[PDB]
Paper text:
The N332-GT5 molecule was designed to engage antibodies containing a specific HCDR3 motif (derived from BG18) but bearing diverse VH and VL gene segments. N332-GT5 was designed to induce diverse human BG18-class type I precursors. We conclude that N332-GT5 consistently induced BG18-like type I B cell responses in RMs.
We employed cryo-electron microscopy (cryo-EM) to determine whether N332-GT5-induced BG18 type I BCRs engaged the N332-GT5 trimer with a BG18-like binding mode as predicted by the sequence analysis. We determined structures of three BG18 type I Fabs, each containing distinct genetic features, in complex with the N332-GT5 trimer, and we also determined the structure of the unliganded trimer for comparison.
Residue numbers in the entry:
A (entry chain C), B (entry chain A), C (entry chain D): 34 to 57, 66 to 77, 82 to 141, 150 to 184, 188 to 309, 312 to 323, 323A, 324 to 397, ...
D (entry chain B), E (entry chain E), F (entry chain F): 521 to 545, 571 to 663
Amino acid sequence: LWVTVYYGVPVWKDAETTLFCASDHNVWATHACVPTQEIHLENVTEEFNMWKNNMVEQMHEDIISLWDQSLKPCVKLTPLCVTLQCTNYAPKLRSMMRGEIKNCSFNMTTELRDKKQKVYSLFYRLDVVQINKEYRLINCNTSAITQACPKVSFEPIPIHYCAPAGFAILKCKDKKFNGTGPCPSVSTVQCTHGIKPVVSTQLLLNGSLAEEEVIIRSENITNNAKNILVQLNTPVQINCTRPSNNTVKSIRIGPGQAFYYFGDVLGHVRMAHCNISKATWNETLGKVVKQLRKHFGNNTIIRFAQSSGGDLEVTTHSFNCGGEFFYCNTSGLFNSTWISDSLILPCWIKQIINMWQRIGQAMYAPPIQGVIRCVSNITGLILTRDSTTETFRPGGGDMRDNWRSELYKYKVVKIEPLGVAPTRCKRR
Amino acid sequence: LWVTVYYGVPVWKDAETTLFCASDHNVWATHACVPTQEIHLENVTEEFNMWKNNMVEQMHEDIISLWDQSLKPCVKLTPLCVTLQCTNYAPKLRSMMRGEIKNCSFNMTTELRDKKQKVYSLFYRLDVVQINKEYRLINCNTSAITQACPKVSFEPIPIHYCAPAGFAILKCKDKKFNGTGPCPSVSTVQCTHGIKPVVSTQLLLNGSLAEEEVIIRSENITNNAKNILVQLNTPVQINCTRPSNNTVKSIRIGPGQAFYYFGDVLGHVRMAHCNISKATWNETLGKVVKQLRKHFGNNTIIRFAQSSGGDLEVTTHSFNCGGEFFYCNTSGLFNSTWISDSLILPCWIKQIINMWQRIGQAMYAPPIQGVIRCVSNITGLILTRDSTTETFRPGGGDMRDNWRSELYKYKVVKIEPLGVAPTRCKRR
Amino acid sequence: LWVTVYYGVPVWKDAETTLFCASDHNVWATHACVPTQEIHLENVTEEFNMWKNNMVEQMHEDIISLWDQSLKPCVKLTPLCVTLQCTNYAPKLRSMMRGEIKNCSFNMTTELRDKKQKVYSLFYRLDVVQINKEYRLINCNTSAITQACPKVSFEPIPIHYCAPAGFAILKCKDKKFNGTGPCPSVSTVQCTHGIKPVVSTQLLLNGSLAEEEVIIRSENITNNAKNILVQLNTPVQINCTRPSNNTVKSIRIGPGQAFYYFGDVLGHVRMAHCNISKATWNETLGKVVKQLRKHFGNNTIIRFAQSSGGDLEVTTHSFNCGGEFFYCNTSGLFNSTWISDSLILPCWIKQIINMWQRIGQAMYAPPIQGVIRCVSNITGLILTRDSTTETFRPGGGDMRDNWRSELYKYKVVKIEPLGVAPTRCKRR
Amino acid sequence: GFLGAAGSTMGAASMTLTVQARNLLWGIKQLQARVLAVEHYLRDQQLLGIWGCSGKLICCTNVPWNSSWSNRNLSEIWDNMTWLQWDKEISNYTQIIYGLLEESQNQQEKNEQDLLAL
Amino acid sequence: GFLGAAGSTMGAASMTLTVQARNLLWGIKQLQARVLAVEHYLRDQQLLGIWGCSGKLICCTNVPWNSSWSNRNLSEIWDNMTWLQWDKEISNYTQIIYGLLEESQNQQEKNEQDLLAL
Amino acid sequence: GFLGAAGSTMGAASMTLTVQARNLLWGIKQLQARVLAVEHYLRDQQLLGIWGCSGKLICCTNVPWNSSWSNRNLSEIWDNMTWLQWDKEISNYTQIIYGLLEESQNQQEKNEQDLLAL
Ligand SMILES: *[C@@H]1O[C@H](CO)[C@@H](O[C@@H]2O[C@H](CO)[C@@H](O)[C@H](O)[C@H]2NC(C)=O)[C@H](O)[C@H]1NC(C)=O
Ligand SMILES: *[C@@H]1O[C@H](CO)[C@@H](O[C@@H]2O[C@H](CO)[C@@H](O)[C@H](O)[C@H]2NC(C)=O)[C@H](O)[C@H]1NC(C)=O
Ligand SMILES: *[C@@H]1O[C@H](CO)[C@@H](O[C@@H]2O[C@H](CO)[C@@H](O)[C@H](O)[C@H]2NC(C)=O)[C@H](O)[C@H]1NC(C)=O
Ligand SMILES: *[C@@H]1O[C@H](CO)[C@@H](O)[C@H](O)[C@H]1NC(C)=O
Ligand SMILES: *[C@@H]1O[C@H](CO)[C@@H](O)[C@H](O)[C@H]1NC(C)=O
Ligand SMILES: *[C@@H]1O[C@H](CO)[C@@H](O)[C@H](O)[C@H]1NC(C)=O
Ligand SMILES: *[C@@H]1O[C@H](CO)[C@@H](O)[C@H](O)[C@H]1NC(C)=O
Ligand SMILES: *[C@@H]1O[C@H](CO)[C@@H](O)[C@H](O)[C@H]1NC(C)=O
Ligand SMILES: *[C@@H]1O[C@H](CO)[C@@H](O)[C@H](O)[C@H]1NC(C)=O
Ligand SMILES: *[C@@H]1O[C@H](CO)[C@@H](O)[C@H](O)[C@H]1NC(C)=O
Ligand SMILES: *[C@@H]1O[C@H](CO)[C@@H](O)[C@H](O)[C@H]1NC(C)=O
Ligand SMILES: *[C@@H]1O[C@H](CO)[C@@H](O)[C@H](O)[C@H]1NC(C)=O
Ligand SMILES: *[C@@H]1O[C@H](CO)[C@@H](O)[C@H](O)[C@H]1NC(C)=O
Ligand SMILES: *[C@@H]1O[C@H](CO)[C@@H](O)[C@H](O)[C@H]1NC(C)=O
Ligand SMILES: *[C@@H]1O[C@H](CO)[C@@H](O)[C@H](O)[C@H]1NC(C)=O
Ligand SMILES: *[C@@H]1O[C@H](CO)[C@@H](O)[C@H](O)[C@H]1NC(C)=O
Ligand SMILES: *[C@@H]1O[C@H](CO)[C@@H](O)[C@H](O)[C@H]1NC(C)=O
Ligand SMILES: *[C@@H]1O[C@H](CO)[C@@H](O)[C@H](O)[C@H]1NC(C)=O
Ligand SMILES: *[C@@H]1O[C@H](CO)[C@@H](O)[C@H](O)[C@H]1NC(C)=O
Ligand SMILES: *[C@@H]1O[C@H](CO)[C@@H](O)[C@H](O)[C@H]1NC(C)=O
Ligand SMILES: *[C@@H]1O[C@H](CO)[C@@H](O)[C@H](O)[C@H]1NC(C)=O
Ligand SMILES: *[C@@H]1O[C@H](CO)[C@@H](O)[C@H](O)[C@H]1NC(C)=O
Ligand SMILES: *[C@@H]1O[C@H](CO)[C@@H](O)[C@H](O)[C@H]1NC(C)=O
Ligand SMILES: *[C@@H]1O[C@H](CO)[C@@H](O)[C@H](O)[C@H]1NC(C)=O
Ligand SMILES: *[C@@H]1O[C@H](CO)[C@@H](O)[C@H](O)[C@H]1NC(C)=O
Ligand SMILES: *[C@@H]1O[C@H](CO)[C@@H](O)[C@H](O)[C@H]1NC(C)=O
């Protein structure tokens, strides 16, 4: 037998490479992204591991870099770390909004360095720290806040990760695939589907749904230090609103430096909230419970409870709705024991945002004029786990787990076109 | 017949690619530019379109990027947006310079944050806005001004655009070529000639001249919304001067931050101006009129008039002369009706420059010590058009049209070396 | 005979190319540097020239770029250029430390723009200029100082320069090689050894030692305008210390902007110094003298003297020890005439550092808590030269000469794999 | 000279293939232009290789000419036309021809392997 | 389709070599990816060239098969196995084989030169 | 080893051509170095291709040796000289030889086409 060299062999190895963006202002720079066939591999079985997938780490770095890039030309707001003289906006409220809005007076800079202006602004209580009464912004002892540009949208736009020549992305089409192990039905694509960079905690919004059944995914289902990602078969609709009509004002704080702030409220002051149907949520939890019993025991009591503690960003359901940042209390959703019409979640609004669990950078989100309403799909959950009873609680804050919930079915492989095999052919 | 593959075929297609700089401090970074054969195509006819030529868009982006890059290490001049206390520099003048120079007192910063200095500076009235009398700089409500570095020259240096391997630049040698359509005499070069990035409005300076006859070029000669570019056969000499002897002073405004300003005037205060010979201008207009009659009718009355309105940057002839920015009134040049010794144009000087028709960026041009004189060639005109009478007016402000006047004869093409043709040759 | 083409010919030409880093926070960014065979050329003689070696210029540009990059995210310290009210720290000292430390009071900024704080700091007298007594920092009239990040180490880490494919680095193994001329024993490597970027003047520390004998290297040994680099056969140990126990304090000067400063001294105040053994230094100089006699004459008197003048950075032995910048007086080392137990060098400490002989950039080095001691090897000297007597003095300040002392044995060459030669073989 | 034969007939221009071939192969613009020039060169070389033409300027094949692509004779194509006109007339069939070339060379390699095994 | 033969037998997949071959060849990520794709392509082409396989997809050589690398017969390798399984079984011998191929082609060129000098 | 034959005679060093050939092929410096290494490799491969030497390390041609380039015999060149000395003696004729090689290969391809048309 003789050694015969074959070039163009359909063989590959696991690889980590640089992926590029394809898409169909906007914080994710989809205009720099290039403009956007699935081939089934009939007898290919491929081993996947969603927990060691470098597409998640690349997506994380890309989303953070795009976020930071969108803030470079925006107003720095250095003059805002001054003493504020604050009172309560509406002293006659007896609702949950009592004390939530502060009417703060301060001396702001102007276009000319030798002139000052007196400004009255409304701030949410979560954005100020008490030193009328003296206050400072929460960021003044840790970071400077940059004002988001009012012209730059925060709406997720689908991003397709395309691989370069010489590499391919394998997709797992097994409806019961749990994110790890052998996949008997694999196809090759060069670009994943469009994944929206939705940023949220506890509840995964506007993502992909499971096919036939709810899917529990965990790096180690018996390690209580790991998160459990739950992919739902059907969505749960969540209707979120900021019912007050907020009037936005603007002042000049330097040459070409405009500061946008919350000016007034037209009409009644009401608490922001989200509505979830009780029957849909209860059916959803029953489905999650059956799938958890499959791993924890058919006779185990499964309990849901509110987040045990930590920063507001992880103890609440955090999301961006219409440009405002909502922090919704989900203790009404995770409060049940499973043995053998509307639900209303109160929400707080914040304007000073500390993204990506970083310290030293902060953003000021300018207010949105009018009344905000948005409707989203809850497509999955992030749960943590604490005998005969197991307790599950909302988790989150590490956005990579939100992206692992979409990239779990993709793997990047390097093509190895050179093969050698014995034949009867001799070179002459 | 058999298919035969030929590699190295002299065939090309229209293409848009990245071009690089070749040349023989300076704002256009000719030191990063690399150091700098014309082959006639005897039977090649090529269709050109100067209005869809991507070399102009690339030149525009390159000139703006180089301009902005030259200002990054220069003094920011943030302390200058203060209230100014201004009076008239020379209350006894009865010439056109009365009220043109303001003697402004202000409190400027120093090397130490706890110390201030009182400064008297001269400003042109076009650089200040009245709030002695209170004034502010014109930029203080729109942008911050960066001081140009006194060591960085603004003198145009020829730039050659060279194409990369696999691409070629075709040059049209037809003396009557109007910028569009078939060109019967085409040659291939890899690098265009050196094009000086001269920035001006209304009058095109120091450019290329037509060969045999004046050439009228327009995207659509019957669309009054388009500009008419006129290439002259012979130059018209323009002698511009800033006759006063200006004394430049300097103060320190921070650690290593020096501010250069207009200190005093030695001798008489006189108005800046440009001299054009009346006979040369009249012959030039007669030539323009005959070429316009060829498009508008032999019996049409052709009228020239001053710019109808807009910002000073477009209503005057704007140019940089010796480091100063001149805004010359051309109403003495465009004031005639054509049916069937020196001319003196008054000029204003400005130090706060808003380049490239942008808002949000501004430059402070430090003053030039002494008396300025420069002699330029007027090589073309930019005209706009408003029965039996047609009226033409000066236009400009979009610098791409200044570069279209030099790049009109060049096209970028991609080489397609693979050809297939029938032959009698069969592979054995 | 026929022309035969050979590809893969072991031939090369002198070339200048881009080299990359290989290594095994830290100011030299060894984490961006990639992870790290010597082949003897039995009959290859290669001409070297250490004075025209572009590896030194590339190393210089790389070290400066890395240094500057490490300061971009650090505190700017703009508020520090204020009037200081200073007194003597220890009025009862009668040692060399009298007047060396100033106790300076100043009004510093805080996290809120409307609030100030009164701060007492200790400064070395070399960092302040007299205007209690009024002082300013030495940098306030030339540059802004950036605080070095306390988390970024200044300890030299070996850097290996590796060449790209198509290029090779030739190493000279001749023990008596003087940096120029033919080298009869040459080997090929792709990456040099690890060269520590040690920054010092007058004395070369922690470098390579000569093999058999001391080596005098000079671009032109008879040109008194050139420096003489001396490579020693054996090291001279130098023990340097900052014996006082300095207490470091910190204040906040803005949102997230912490200023670290020299707070107090615990125990006695003592002068920093370096110890060199007298016998070792005298033997070292005797060796240098014999090698100088080989070039200047066996009957010439060789004199050593202290640096004649200039900035402290070049008149003293400058080095970084434990994070502090030492300026040691070497007049006790270079004070002898050569015809036919401990030595103690006093040292000054500076916190405001002007690196790489540049003007316009300056660094503030935050103080190091406690007592500093370091032991280094003196591996070479930088000498300058001023009848029958020759006088040699310490030189330095141009760091390229420190790197020429390590890169003198390496040359970069381009491989020219295509050769043509006559043979008897004819193409059929 | 480079592209000097562009206006010449297809026959005459076939003897200048080395002239154009040698010409097929601020800092960021130069770097991107260099990378794209390399990719175009290699793409054309890959097409030549897969057709069995990796080392030739004039490469004869075993794909017959289909008269529907062009019904001109050889004297019209080679003595009257230039390569620019020819590329324009048959540009619409370029991808058809390339596919046929790809199939024929692959088939030929199979037969070569089949013959060397005997 | 690209990699469609990945699950097919080694014999059947040997007729799709052009399919994978044609697929072997934000701005900074795209630029770095383009440069690395070019380097991988050229590295494989260089290996083919030094073995005397610069223009072929199926290239027969003069290096004998060593039964210690694989003791399977040809029907097992070509009719039952896919290329992924084959690459996995003999991956540990890849560098041995390449070295032998490099030596044989170099020796063959010497003999060619030796014969053309007569 | 790489360049180990640099000090050896031209004959002996002709058997190590694969050793140097395999070695011909902060982030910005690495990227620019990679791109320039690729361009140099491809430029040399293009010269080999246009001369008809695209797949060879030792390539014999039909260009005669002109005694004005070097009047040494073969034993002096191959048994006494190294390749560095040879490149130095005839560096001034490198561009003359390359031009002749370019013409001969192009002429040979014409004749091949002429013979396959019969
Ligand atoms: C989930 O998707 C929905 C629909 O795309 C988002 O709601 C829309 O948001 C835009 C931007 O504010 C509005 O113009 C649309 O009117 C909204 N749709 C509806 C039906 O109200 C929703 O914001 C997304 N959720 C998240 C977290 O991004
Ligand atoms: C047109 O070209 C002329 C000549 O190159 C320019 O005038 C020169 O400008 C430089 C720089 O100030 C002076 O040193 C020369 O002495 C000038 N020449 C003369 C004859 O005075 C002129 O500035 C150019 N016009 C424009 C708009 O750039
Ligand atoms: C020369 O090398 C020595 C040893 O590597 C350096 O001294 C060490 O410095 C580090 C950092 O401060 C200390 O942790 C070690 O304890 C020191 N070693 C000893 C023995 O004290 C010395 O600083 C280097 N010299 C220069 C100029 O960089
Ligand atoms: C603004 O500054 C003045 C002093 O000029 C002070 O009296 C006043 O209270 C300040 N206002 C606020 C809201 O801090
Ligand atoms: C996922 O499936 C694998 C088997 O392929 C199993 O070992 C693992 O425990 C499963 N994990 C979860 C969370 O379902
Ligand atoms: C999973 O977690 C359990 C409990 O922490 C541990 O004993 C087990 O080894 C883990 N498995 C793996 C594969 O790490
Ligand atoms: C939620 O339901 C309440 C009634 O319980 C209704 O008043 C409110 O408007 C609803 N909000 C949304 C956002 O659906
Ligand atoms: C909010 O207030 C604005 C007036 O500022 C009004 O035009 C708009 O209709 C209001 N919207 C609602 C939902 O009340
Ligand atoms: C804040 O307080 C001031 C003073 O009491 C008042 O004039 C202003 O209207 C208040 N702001 C709002 C939004 O009511
Ligand atoms: C929710 O999911 C349904 C499919 O079940 C889809 O039609 C709908 O558009 C989704 N809503 C959002 C807001 O994405
Ligand atoms: C400078 O500031 C003082 C107040 O300290 C003021 O009286 C004076 O008018 C100012 N001068 C100018 C020119 O504005
Ligand atoms: C330019 O010439 C073309 C003919 O080639 C003609 O159609 C067009 O109108 C001309 N335009 C001008 C402005 O001369
Ligand atoms: C030129 O302008 C005229 C008048 O606006 C218009 O009718 C004509 O269609 C234009 N021609 C083209 C080619 O756009
Ligand atoms: C313009 O002409 C006038 C005479 O009318 C003369 O005084 C002046 O100096 C001239 N200026 C220039 C710049 O030629
Ligand atoms: C301008 O004034 C300076 C004195 O500052 C003098 O030396 C120079 O000659 C003057 N130039 C003219 C043209 O008057
Ligand atoms: C500006 O005015 C001040 C005060 O009247 C005067 O001292 C100064 O000289 C004036 N500036 C000039 C340039 O004359
Ligand atoms: C004006 O054009 C003539 C050619 O007609 C040329 O010699 C002269 O140098 C030009 N002047 C300038 C300033 O470019
Ligand atoms: C701080 O500022 C006050 C004025 O508010 C001044 O009296 C005091 O002397 C300053 N202190 C120092 C150390 O400069
Ligand atoms: C170095 O050696 C060369 C001879 O190779 C000699 O010409 C030169 O003067 C020497 N220089 C020194 C400083 O030793
Ligand atoms: C070395 O320096 C001496 C004295 O300056 C000079 O005469 C000699 O020419 C120089 N040699 C070289 C090679 O430059
Ligand atoms: C320096 O002082 C600290 C107390 O701040 C003490 O713990 C440490 O041991 C002292 N070191 C020396 C060498 O005296
Ligand atoms: C500096 O002086 C002040 C006032 O005399 C004193 O309180 C402080 O302790 C001194 N600093 C030190 C380090 O002794
Ligand atoms: C000094 O040199 C000796 C070798 O002679 C070495 O062992 C020692 O580690 C060196 N010291 C330093 C600090 O590098
Ligand atoms: C151009 O055409 C003429 C025939 O009209 C021909 O003689 C000449 O050679 C052609 N030029 C080229 C470069 O082929
Ligand atoms: C998959 O395997 C079956 C045999 O079980 C075979 O018939 C089919 O052709 C294979 N698919 C491919 C793409 O080779
Ligand atoms: C070096 O030259 C000697 C003859 O002096 C020879 O024997 C030896 O092989 C040569 N070395 C190499 C690597 O060719």
